[PDB]
Amino acid sequence: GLEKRQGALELIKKGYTQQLAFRQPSSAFAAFVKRAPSTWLTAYVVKVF
Numbered sequence: 001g002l003e004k005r006q007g008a009l010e011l012i013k014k015g016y017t018q019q020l021a022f023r024q025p026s027s028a029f030a031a032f033v034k035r036a037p038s039t040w041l042t043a044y045v046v047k048v049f
Contacts, residue, residue, distance in 0.1 A: 019045065 024031055028037035029045050 016049070 015048060022033060022035060024033060026037060029042045030038045
C-alpha cells in the first residue's frame, strides 16, 4: 500500500515509550512496576529493541 509505513513507525515509537513506563530502577522489566523482575521478559525486550 505504501505511505502507511510512516504510521507504522509511530506505533513502534509509541510502543517503545510505553514499555519504558514498566522499566524498574534495576533496568529490568516486568508485568508491572510492582511485580518481581522477569528474567525472560527482560531478555525478550532486548531481542525486539
